Amino acid sequence: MTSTFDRVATIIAETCDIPRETITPESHAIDDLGIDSLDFLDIAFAIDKAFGIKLPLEKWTQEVNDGKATTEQYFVLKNLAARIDELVAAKGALEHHHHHH
């Protein structure tokens, strides 16, 4: 059950004003959804804001550039939701005290 993706696809539907139904977990941001890097910046900011995590989008690009990881691992919605879910479990250890809303 891609419940993290339920949350993320709601966020994209708020940002781009595209219905959540057009956003499937298999969708590649810079292909299927036609989301630019400049558009995905604000989506990534709204995810960062929502879950109380940080998406290191800059370093994720560097992962692809150095061959540490694939571009699809950060720009496909099932795999991005997985990365977010990893960072939610991670931040549970060392999150700074911001009133969760």
Side-chain angles (χ1 to χ4, degrees), residues 14-47:
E14 296 295 276
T15 304
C16 312
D17 294 278
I18 57 181
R20 187 208 288 183
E21 60 185 285
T22 61
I23 309 159
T24 57
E26 62 178 84
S27 299
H28 187 267
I30 314 175
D31 181 88
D32 187 87
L33 299 181
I35 298 177
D36 290 86
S37 53
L38 51 77
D39 184 80
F40 194 74
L41 200 165
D42 189 270
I43 302 177
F45 181 82
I47 296 171

Side-chain angles (χ1 to χ4, degrees), residues 49-50 52 91 95-101:
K49 176 180 175 59
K91 75 107 185 178
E95 63 187 278
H96 291 136
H97 300 126
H98 180 264
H99 187 92
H100 180 242
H101 172 258

